[PDB]
Design an enzyme around this catalytic site. Sequence first.
Site, PDB file in Angstrom:
ATOM      1  CG  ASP A   1      29.731 -14.981  20.540  1.00 11.35           C
ATOM      2  OD1 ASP A   1      29.804 -13.865  20.007  1.00 11.35           O
ATOM      3  OD2 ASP A   1      28.795 -15.256  21.304  1.00 11.35           O
TER       4      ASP A   1
ATOM      5  CG  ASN B   1      12.002   2.352  -3.626  1.00  8.47           C
ATOM      6  OD1 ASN B   1      13.176   2.630  -3.913  1.00  8.47           O
ATOM      7  ND2 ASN B   1      11.321   1.425  -4.259  1.00  8.47           N
TER       8      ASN B   1
ATOM      9  CG  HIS C   1      29.888 -11.827  14.786  1.00  3.38           C
ATOM     10  ND1 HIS C   1      30.546 -12.058  15.981  1.00  3.38           N
ATOM     11  CD2 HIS C   1      28.699 -12.479  14.875  1.00  3.38           C
ATOM     12  CE1 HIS C   1      29.772 -12.788  16.771  1.00  3.38           C
ATOM     13  NE2 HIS C   1      28.643 -13.053  16.128  1.00  3.38           N
TER      14      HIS C   1
ATOM     15  CG  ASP D   1      17.356   3.604  -3.387  1.00  2.00           C
ATOM     16  OD1 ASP D   1      16.281   3.093  -3.815  1.00  2.00           O
ATOM     17  OD2 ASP D   1      18.071   3.030  -2.530  1.00  2.00           O
TER      18      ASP D   1
ATOM     19  CB  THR E   1      25.123 -14.767  16.297  1.00  2.00           C
ATOM     20  OG1 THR E   1      26.284 -14.429  17.067  1.00  2.00           O
ATOM     21  CG2 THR E   1      25.202 -16.218  15.956  1.00  2.00           C
TER      22      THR E   1
HETATM   23  C1  LIG Z   1      23.046 -19.927  16.132  1.00  4.49           C
HETATM   24  N1  LIG Z   1      22.930 -21.422  16.182  1.00  4.49           N
HETATM   25  C2  LIG Z   1      22.969 -22.363  15.139  1.00  4.49           C
HETATM   26  C3  LIG Z   1      23.073 -22.113  13.747  1.00  4.49           C
HETATM   27  C4  LIG Z   1      24.119 -22.753  13.066  1.00  4.49           C
HETATM   28  N2  LIG Z   1      24.316 -22.521  11.770  1.00  4.49           N
HETATM   29  C5  LIG Z   1      23.488 -21.680  11.131  1.00  4.49           C
HETATM   30  O1  LIG Z   1      23.727 -21.427   9.839  1.00  4.49           O
HETATM   31  C6  LIG Z   1      24.883 -22.005   9.217  1.00  4.49           C
HETATM   32  C7  LIG Z   1      24.384 -23.332   8.642  1.00  4.49           C
HETATM   33  C8  LIG Z   1      25.476 -23.832   7.629  1.00  4.49           C
HETATM   34  O2  LIG Z   1      25.918 -22.780   6.684  1.00  4.49           O
HETATM   35  C9  LIG Z   1      26.478 -21.654   7.302  1.00  4.49           C
HETATM   36  C10 LIG Z   1      25.311 -21.027   8.110  1.00  4.49           C
HETATM   37  C11 LIG Z   1      22.389 -21.020  11.689  1.00  4.49           C
HETATM   38  C12 LIG Z   1      21.523 -20.098  10.878  1.00  4.49           C
HETATM   39  C13 LIG Z   1      20.934 -18.880  11.631  1.00  4.49           C
HETATM   40  C14 LIG Z   1      20.004 -19.961  11.150  1.00  4.49           C
HETATM   41  C15 LIG Z   1      22.189 -21.249  13.041  1.00  4.49           C
HETATM   42  N3  LIG Z   1      22.923 -23.630  15.621  1.00  4.49           N
HETATM   43  N4  LIG Z   1      22.857 -23.494  16.980  1.00  4.49           N
HETATM   44  C16 LIG Z   1      22.843 -22.171  17.379  1.00  4.49           C
HETATM   45  O3  LIG Z   1      22.770 -21.723  18.506  1.00  4.49           O
HETATM   46 CA   LIG Z   2      14.846   2.431  -5.531  1.00  6.15          CA
HETATM   47 ZN   LIG Z   3      28.011 -12.893  20.645  1.00  8.00          ZN
END
Ligand SMILES: Cn1c(-c2cnc(OC3CCOCC3)c(C3CC3)c2)n[nH]c1=O
Ligand SMILES: [Ca+2]
Ligand SMILES: [Zn+2]
Length: 805
Positions: free
Chosen positions: A261, A685, A309, A683, A159
């Site tokens: 999920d 590194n 995912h 490659d 996630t």
């Molecule tokens: C997992 N999570 C989140 C959460 C929601 N959106 C996110 O990114 C999106 C924001 C908009 O563009 C698409 C990406 C993130 C990124 C991981 C920091 C975290 N909020 N609460 C909760 O459990």
């Molecule tokens: Ca390299």
């Molecule tokens: Zn999950």
Amino acid sequence: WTATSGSCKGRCFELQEVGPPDCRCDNLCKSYSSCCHDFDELCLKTARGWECTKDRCGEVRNEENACHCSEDCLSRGDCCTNYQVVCKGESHWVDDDCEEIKVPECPAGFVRPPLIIFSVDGFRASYMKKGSKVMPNIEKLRSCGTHAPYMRPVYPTKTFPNLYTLATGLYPESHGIVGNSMYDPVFDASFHLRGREKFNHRWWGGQPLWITATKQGVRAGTFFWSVSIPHERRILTILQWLSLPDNERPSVYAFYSEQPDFSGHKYGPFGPEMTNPLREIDKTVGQLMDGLKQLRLHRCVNVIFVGDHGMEDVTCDRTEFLSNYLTNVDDITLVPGTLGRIRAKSINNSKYDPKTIIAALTCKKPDQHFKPYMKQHLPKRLHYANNRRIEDIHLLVDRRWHVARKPLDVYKKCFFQGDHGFDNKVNSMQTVFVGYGPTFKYRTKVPPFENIELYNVMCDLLGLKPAPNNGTHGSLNHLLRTNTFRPTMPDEVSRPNYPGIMYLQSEFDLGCTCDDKVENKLEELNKRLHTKGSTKERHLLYGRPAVLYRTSYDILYHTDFESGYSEIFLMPLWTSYTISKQAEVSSIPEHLTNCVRPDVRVSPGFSQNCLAYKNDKQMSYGFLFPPYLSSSPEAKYDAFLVTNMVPMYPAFKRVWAYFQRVLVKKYASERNGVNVISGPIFDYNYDGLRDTEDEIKQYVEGSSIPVPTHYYSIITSCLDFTQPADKCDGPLSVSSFILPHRPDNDESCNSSEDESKWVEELMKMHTARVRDIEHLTGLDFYRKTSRSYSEILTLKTYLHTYESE
Ligand SMILES: Cn1c(-c2cnc(OC3CCOCC3)c(C3CC3)c2)n[nH]c1=O
Ligand SMILES: [Ca+2]
Ligand SMILES: [Zn+2]
Ligand SMILES: *[C@@H]1O[C@H](CO)[C@@H](O[C@@H]2O[C@H](CO)[C@@H](O[C@@H]3O[C@H](CO[C@H]4O[C@H](CO)[C@@H](O)[C@H](O[C@H]5O[C@H](CO)[C@@H](O)[C@H](O)[C@@H]5O[C@H]5O[C@H](CO)[C@@H](O)[C@H](O)[C@@H]5O)[C@@H]4O)[C@@H](O)[C@H](O[C@H]4O[C@H](CO)[C@@H](O)[C@H](O)[C@@H]4O[C@H]4O[C@H](CO)[C@@H](O)[C@H](O)[C@@H]4O)[C@@H]3O)[C@H](O)[C@H]2NC(C)=O)[C@H](O)[C@H]1NC(C)=O
Ligand SMILES: [Cl-]
Ligand code: NA
Ligand code: NA
């Protein structure tokens, strides 16, 4: 400490966060125990629920209500999302025919169409077809907008790595969020899902969309929602923000759903319990679209519906235990589950050895469901190595399985029936993309694409210049009606030399021998024209690759192939040849078995030598243009030129010889001819980028011949396979690979068998994008075709995955 005794009055869901110890009223305050005493009462109202009913119509504004059905609600921006439907005879958005949105139809004062990003956790790509009966709002977005059959996540298909990739356009190795769990040895600190450390900014690299927007004067909605705030309240808050005056109103917003999920973990991806969560997500989409329609914003906003995912069937009984393989299980730390990362339990234990751990984990059981790797040996397509947070030892876990340290870890931690995290090529990990709005195309299906590309497009949607990222800007132009990004091809940095015959045979002392001293005006003008490039249009179909860095190199023409030969690396950077459907495979004549011939166009001083291979007991050599596909007994001598030779471990020669002898002819038959470009990659590194000379860690013994870490091939033909590769009038089709150049075949557990049983499986595992090869070589391909550059960028990002439908 927070002085939580200030008030949220007038401040509910404020847009700028306040600095402790003043109390907070923003959408994240709960997650910090920092909300003002009165946040629930003022900001989280629930009275009377979420929908207008017949008898609430016209009501007197009771401020206690969760949402309103009074007359002033529209102008206040706080009606229940179904207000106009219940009380004004309006229809739900999902019941209206869709009509093309040719231009944004926005209220006065909007400077650009707002962007709403609706992200869903664990939304597997096949839910779009399999759950379509229960998701009418989502199906209308999908069929009326622009959609992909699926969208490829990054690895690991967890996630946080994926949401942050969506936000940044960067691989996890570059943004730093390399799993849901991490140890950073420089900080000496750990990151976890539960807890406080994840809030520290030092975990989070790159520049996410909200920071990009802010820096460029585009206002962003605070993106993140504390988990207890219900979905209905999140939607109403977004709709209220969209009612702010022009100078305060964000242009970009985010909604996040923890479903499907959450349920998918408990019930598996297709558990009968999964229908309800999907219905519920659709209802939330319906509420947003009804709300936008009330605000006359439904033909103004661009909406992105995007997953992080998928979800696979995984149960406690499909767990492999490292205690079944390792005697020393207590001296290691395992990050467990759908991938494995191993390091030493204690840095003070100098007896820990990764070499012996890998060996004890390699091919030990007939149906073993994980494979161990040193991280630099993982398929390059994963881009999962260049970060100190990624442990040297990695286990790629088979889909549907888990790995754990000890059986105690599993029954003292069957609960779950679903999980994710596996190789991002796996079908069950694929996720969804739909774009709907004035800036997206109408009723358009686009091919599958990778989530690293979306940050550029979100920037395009907001008129922002993207921070430097791993997307290929322009490769998703075909999703967009307008705001396209018009890139230019990179400029060539080094121009080639075209050497003629300049050296006599006797100037070379390379210890090479060839049985070739055998003797004509007709056919001597012939060989000359071939060496001047007469057949070049046959073998170089898309122009020569451009070299995008400073170096010294020669173009060499031959009857059957063309190459760009590097005077610095003593071998070709690239070799290009075309094999028609009709071509015939021959074998290397006996007299020519160990033949290597000096190339009289290239000085002894810039040539490899045979003595070095003789002295190097580990290293042998192979050829880039295969002698087996020579067009005539006479053309075959060109294939034994020292300038076509590359160093190869005997174990890798098994792989390479089967590719060249069997597989190339097979693809030519199947695809109606192919053009092949092959070459070395360095490659050392493991950063996914071409090494300079001074980064090379290994040379053929006693010489300055550098040893490649990998070999690539790019295999192009006509997408319309009724046309031969060399006479193709439209779009192209490509598959590519980057094979690791290894001294053993430990990676392939059945390698003691015939190459026909294991080599093609290895090649498939190391499938790659042309773009991956470009990064690794500093070359730019497809410089001269009749196709649009955007279309070529899409082709360069294509990955042939070998998964079924
Ligand atoms: C997992 N999570 C989140 C959460 C929601 N959106 C996110 O990114 C999106 C924001 C908009 O563009 C698409 C990406 C993130 C990124 C991981 C920091 C975290 N909020 N609460 C909760 O459990
Ligand atoms: Ca390299
Ligand atoms: Zn999950
Ligand atoms: C995918 O896209 C990304 C983004 O385009 C590509 O990654 C970029 O690649 C560049 C080339 O490798 C790299 O440029 C370097 O920048 C150094 C300055 O870096 C800081 O500043 C930037 C800009 O704000 C910032 O983004 C960086 O953030 C990184 O670091 C912190 C942690 O330290 C993380 O929070 C963050 O996630 C990110 O980490 C990632 O990148 C670093 C590498 O920078 C990795 O080590 C991590 O593992 C992780 O992957 C930084 O805060 C700059 O100092 C470098 O300059 C050196 O090399 C030049 C050549 O021009 C040389 O002339 C200089 O002298 C200098 O060398 C000196 O330092 C050396 C090292 O100590 C030393 O050996 C020498 O002797 C010298 O003293 C360099 O220009 C850029 O930082 C990253 N950007 C990002 C976001 O990762 C990536 O390549 C793409 N992937 C593919 C496959 O295409
Ligand atoms: Cl993880
Ligand atoms: Na040798
Ligand atoms: Na093997």
